[PDB]
Amino acid sequence: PQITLWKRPLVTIKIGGQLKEALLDTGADDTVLEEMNLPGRWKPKMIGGIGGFIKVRQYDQILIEICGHKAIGTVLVGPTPVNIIGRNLLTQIGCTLNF
Amino acid sequence: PQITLWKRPLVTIKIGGQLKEALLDTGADDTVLEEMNLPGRWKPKMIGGIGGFIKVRQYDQILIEICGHKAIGTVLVGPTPVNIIGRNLLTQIGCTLNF
Numbered sequence A, B: 001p002q003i004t005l006w007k008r009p010l011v012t013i014k015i016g017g018q019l020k021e022a023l024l025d026t027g028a029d030d031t032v033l034e035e036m037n038l039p040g041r042w043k044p045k046m047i048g049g050i051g052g053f054i055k056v057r058q059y060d061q062i063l064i065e066i067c068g069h070k071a072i073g074t075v076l077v078g079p080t081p082v083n084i085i086g087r088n089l090l091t092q093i094g095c096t097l098n099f
């Protein structure tokens, strides 16, 4: 699906049996999701942004179905204001910018 | 030009006669640039992101040529870690997400 940018590029995702809305973010290198109980082992990590840094839990090899397209990659979980799908997963579904 | 997301979608911009590199960010509503000397009147503002908020100076009706595409819109200037082109300007140059 071609998505215009007149509105926030929000998509429906399926992760860990839960349905959520996430922002397709080309400015994010990786994926970070609001707090949730994702299964598996994880190791603490720190991510930075415009306002500073937040503490996140790094889960690897996590399945996510973004708008019906499946991808497996690292998923960070922490106090992010919004769910954002980063380039680590956008590349798997074949997402591209076009102008 | 079609841009894949295996690398950061960085583009060359020209603003205020200055050459810089900026990130095409579909997850950003507006444009924020690292500290620079932009001509004109400005109004204080606050923007929030991952980690908190920063104080920026709001310049309106600023010309930017993104990869050869010209646009005029609000440009924020403050302590952002990276230059980010937001949807306010991505829509003017006809940027669309595709997967």
Ligand SMILES: CC(C)CN(C[C@@H](O)[C@H](Cc1cc(F)cc(F)c1)NC(=O)O[C@H]1CO[C@H]2OCC[C@H]21)S(=O)(=O)c1ccc2c(c1)CC[C@H]2O
Pocket (backbone or CB within 6 Å): A023, A025, A026, A027, A028, A029, A030, A031, A032, A047, A048, A049, A050, A051, A082, A084, A086, B025, B026, B027, B028, B029, B030, B031, B032, B047, B048, B049, B050, B076, B080, B081, B082, B084, B086
């Ligand atoms: C989260 C989204 C919804 C909103 N953000 C856009 C996001 O793309 C951002 C871009 C960035 C920021 C940065 F500090 C350094 C960078 F290298 C890149 N990346 C991000 O936080 O991603 C994280 C996960 O991956 C990691 O890699 C990159 C950083 C880490 S924002 O910046 O909070 C924001 C909010 C309000 C406004 C604007 C911007 C513009 C004016 C106003 O409208």
